[model samples]
Target: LPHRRFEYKYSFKGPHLVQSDGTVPFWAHAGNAIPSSDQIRVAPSLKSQRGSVWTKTKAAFENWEVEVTFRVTGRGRIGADGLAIWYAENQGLEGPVFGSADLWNGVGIFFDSFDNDGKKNNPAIVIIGNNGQIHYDHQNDGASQALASCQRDFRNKPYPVRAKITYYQNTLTVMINNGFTPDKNDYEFCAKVENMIIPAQGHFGISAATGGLADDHDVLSFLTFQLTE
Candidate 1:
């Protein structure tokens, strides 16, 4: 039974983080993450920048679940770029693709809020798999390249939004709550994929960026559980 679970509640003091045993549990890269009593602000509402944080513990479970509560807020008509929840062999690298490195060697679940299409704000959730040969196209929003995706207005929700991702038996599933203002009890299916091959183990990370438009990308809580059922 190989498993790992890490939680971030932002109740502790610091520009540093400590695990339950009071040892540092993660490493911050790119732009530093500001820790407050309420939440860890991954990226501020600034233009042309990138930031990321990764767990010190590697994820080795073949079947696992990751749940995160986050919010994006800004004082503009639209927000640029977005955040990415990543499981890759490497930590953080800067690029023009979805706030993280392109052609990474694992899985990435992106919460994109920019408008690659002119029709709308173009908030979207996309999943991608990289074998280190495929490159991400930032111009087209990876539309023609993503393994799976769905459109959702993740920006400016009525309440904080939740993302739950599960990987089991070669099936990857994404479920998102429709905001939490009225106490939504169920999560709607966002996307799913089958017959996908992932690495045996990787590091868990959250990366975000902003371009001409900017938003405050905040991660309130993160929880991971290894599934045995």
Candidate 2:
């Protein structure tokens, strides 16, 4: 069965809810984001703190695939904080943890850029699951508590970088494409997990934050596909 689908080319003239052929509607929420004709600016390159945008529709699919095209560009050699793609309960709420909230009951995939592990400009991707009990270790950038992670260079390289996430059965996979061109066949495996259990329904969101450093984190597109066994 088909679940949910959304595509954003910023075809609309101003900030508005993006709707597809389906009945469900998708809106954009941001703490300090600017929406243009082509992209949603998650954060600016002037200062620090948190900025985010999430969907208003609740996803009910047991298995799914989501692809987002975004880029982080700034004037510095290293960027602060990072971006996150999340599927969790309690749709819209801002917090001090990873541009979202802590103790959230769901899953999050982080594209971290700062060097919290003493590694210079350590750009990495990590996935974590929360049961509404554990807290995110922001001091360590969740390096000590992630379920799975891998390092990749995803900043200041291309116009539009992409990430694709797929969940089937008990396995979750993440793929990344470091190019401006959009091609599903060009994505490379970044990380994967198995035996994980998440809720059958939740809300989808994208978030990014900055502390001392800054960057122009923009999301150009978001697309979702329902999957089955």
lDDT of 1 by residue, 109-222 (tens): 888888776646378898988888888867677777789998887777768788888888788889998585666446899999898888888777777888888888877666
TM-score of each: 0.85, 0.86
CA deviation > 4 Å runs, candidate 1:
1-24, 27-29, 119-121, 182-185
lDDT agreement with native, every candidate: 0.73, 0.75
**Weakest 10 consecutive residues, lDDT, candidate 2?**
9-18
Model 2 clash pairs are 49-210
Please give the RMSD to the true structure for each candidate, in Å: 4.1, 4.4
RMSD of model 2 against the true structure:
4.4
Segments in model 2 whose C-alpha atoms lie over 4 Å from true places: 1-25, 180-184
Q: In lDDT terms, which candidate is top?
A: 2
lDDT agreement of model 2 with the native: 0.75
